[PDB]
Design a protein around this nucleic acid. Structure first.
Lengths: 186, 102, 94
RNA sequence: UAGCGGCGAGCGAACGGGGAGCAGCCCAGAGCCUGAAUCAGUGUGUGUGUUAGUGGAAGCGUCUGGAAAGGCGCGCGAUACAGGGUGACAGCCCCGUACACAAAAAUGCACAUGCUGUGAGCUCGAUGAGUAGGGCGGGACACGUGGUAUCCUGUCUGAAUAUGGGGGGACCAUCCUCCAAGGCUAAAUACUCCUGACUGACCGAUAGUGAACCAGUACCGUGAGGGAAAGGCGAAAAGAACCCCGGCGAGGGGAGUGAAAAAGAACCUGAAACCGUGUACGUACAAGCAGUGGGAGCACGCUUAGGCGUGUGACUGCGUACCUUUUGUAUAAUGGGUCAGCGACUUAUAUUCUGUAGCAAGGUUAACCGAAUAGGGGAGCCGAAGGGAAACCGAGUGCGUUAAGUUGCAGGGUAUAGACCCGAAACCCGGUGACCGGGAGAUAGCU
């Protein structure tokens, strides 16, 4: 549906099926848990009685200072996610966000110089404290002057992490960024 | 890190000595400093037959972390931090708040 | 609202754990119908990667419900296909 | 999986395509002119990393407060709110932090290099001469040298070299590939004794390396080898001046230091079993899984009596422990002293079913590339139109027909990995004068 930029009255039409699909709780749950599992690092191991220093049995796990009866070798918990499921989850989360009016779009969000004070003043004018900033082509003036702000993040369309959209209460889009995400997601 | 040197006036910031100033006797490797009449201690001296023990309680000075103290700029009458710059001959430390030069 | 999302009911099960707990219980017509050059012939079978790699024998076996009026040439054509495939308007000949 | 397989257990292809880079060269040698590309060493200069390092932003009053970094109020920096130390949780107390710089030298790597050495480019010979192959006396392929492909070898024969010789298909014919018998080739392929950083939905002390503690130490064994238990005072020792008893000891007591000495060195919190003191009750005329229902009596608070609670229980009816296999059991099958801690159905690959999520006659990506969970990549795999061995039929052939399958997640099953755990005797190798380490958390049965 048409979304008003509240700055220039230049609402850009978007596909109804993209920002109008019903919120599928199961799909978002699946994608979130898959991403969380992917974030896991396979760094965990212990030694069994076969590979425990000593000789023999004294090395049996029941004996003190022995091996572990239930040792587990290092493993990766990541599981692949179908591309169509990922796209559907993105569409569902975008539809849910726009439904509750937690998504903000502006014609262009850029800073003339890489000054954190100017960015903070602009955010204060916008009445936003802990929000997600996402745009299209990377801007050095904006990216450079945003790392220090823990609650403010700046990225590109190719790096739209679905889980990140949940952590931040509000998300700020860009005129070109909306078109880019719409065309790439399809 | 030569912010605090010998024979300089320093004021404590945190711990039982807020406001009181003093003169630094010396500094230690760990960073602790000694300032006269800032943190009095009632250490008991074990009776030693030799070494000409005066006898009785001894009122010495304990050790205070450099963090709890800061150089006091008497010109401005307020505690302030310090910085370093290069001069023609050598390097010296200067206070903040309009950069007073020592 | 991360703490408002739950999975579908019945999709998660802890599973049994024996012992613990005394009171815990215990070639067809549809195929290559439209593949941008799905002409019924012995050629292109290997390229399409539809019947193994070393498979050469080909047949147009059908089971009623004619729904693909595809003409067949170059394969074993008999009277059987005549009475079935032609019902949909297609032609079958050797 | 094709195949192999007492056609049994079980063992195990090739071609093709998708991915990273792709290189073929030199000699067997001469003619023309050159030290012209290239490959190595010796010295100048430039850039880029290491061995010391420099600069690098910003705060205060009140309250609890042992001490403020904590709450409250008002300000500042941020190309730095990563980390650490700081009497309680620090962006603005300190080292660092993003960022900008720094070398006489040792040095690694790239370049213009002068010099020292082989060496431009075109032409036409040249296809690697006891070489194959064959054969004799021996050895290895279920196998007593057998029909023995093929290989090892002491010895004997043995042609050609683009007029040429091998290998393969073809019953033979035909047809296809090379220059065999002289050499070289970083590149993409696996791993960590050590070094710097980084990351742990890994462990916090019966765990984690055997060892966070002066650990491969004490200790056991001539011998090889085996192999431990044991870390935390206090923010700062500010470590109890001094006095009293005691044996001028140890153990202490008082005062003082210390927030705290229910922090005193054996020094955070200090469980259970065990051991003693005081408090209230019962027991010296009463028999047995020592409990249970009622219950007078005795002591304390309480309804300031009101029949209420707590502490004990004179008496009364009833009252033959826990685990296992056995029809069943203390009965005379079976084992346990108590406490605290340690210890038991996960995971890897296939196959079957259920729930769940989409897509849907389509579903679906591997490797890999990749601004590295995005996207690309349709290599590949599954299914969507009958089955009868094949032939041949072909809604038809005793078997079936238009309903729909695939991919992720979790769970219920099966097989292979030792896979719920503990518990043998024997054998080999390499060592020590019978013992030590490994195969081996071996193996089958049975508790």
């Amino acid at each position: 549906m048409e979304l008003v930029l509240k700055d220039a009255q230049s609402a850009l039409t978007v596909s109804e099926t993209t920002f109008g699909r019903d919120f599928n709780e199961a799909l978002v749950h699946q994608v979130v848990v898959a991403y969380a599992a992917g974030a896991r690092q396979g760094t965990r191991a212990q030694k069994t009685r076969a590979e425990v220093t000593g000789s023999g049995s004294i090395k049996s796990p029941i004996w003190r200072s022995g091996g572990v009866t239930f040792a587990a070798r290092p493993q990766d918990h990541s599981q692949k996610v179908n591309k169509k499921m990922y796209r559907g989850a993105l569409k569902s989360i975008l539809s849910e966000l726009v439904r509750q009016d937690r998504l903000i779009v502006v014609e262009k969000f850029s800073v003339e110089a890489p000054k954190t004070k100017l960015l903070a003043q602009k955010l204060k004018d916008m009445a936003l404290e802990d929000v997600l900033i996402i745009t299209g082509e990377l801007d050095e003036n904006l990216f450079l002057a945003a790392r220090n702000l823990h609650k403010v993040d700046v990225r590109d369309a190719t790096g739209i992490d679905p889980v990140s959209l949940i952590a931040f209460d509000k998300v700020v889009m860009t005129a070109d960024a909306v078109k880019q995400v719409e065309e790439m997601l399809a | 890190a030569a912010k605090i040197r010998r024979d300089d006036e320093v004021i404590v910031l945190t711990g039982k000595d807020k406001g009181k100033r003093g003169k630094v006797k010396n500094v230690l490797s760990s960073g602790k400093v000694i300032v006269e009449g800032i943190n009095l201690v009632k250490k008991h001296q074990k009776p030693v037959p030799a070494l000409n023990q005066p006898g009785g309680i001894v009122e010495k000075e304990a050790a205070i972390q450099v963090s709890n103290v800061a150089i006091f700029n008497a010109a401005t009458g307020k505690a302030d931090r310090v910085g370093f710059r290069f001069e023609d001959g050598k390097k010296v430390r200067f206070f903040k708040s309009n950069s007073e030069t020592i | 609202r991360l703490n408002t999302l739950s999975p579908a009911e019945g999709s998660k099960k802890a599973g049994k754990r024996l012992g613990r707990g005394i009171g815990s219980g215990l070639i067809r017509l549809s195929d290559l119908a439209k593949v941008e050059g799905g002409v019924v012939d012995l050629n292109t079978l290997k390229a399409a990667n539809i019947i193994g790699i070393q498979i050469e024998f080909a047949k147009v076996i059908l089971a009623g419900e004619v729904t693909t009026p595809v003409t067949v040439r170059g394969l074993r054509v008999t009277k059987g296909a005549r009475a079935a495939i032609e019902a949909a308007g297609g032609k079958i000949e050797e």
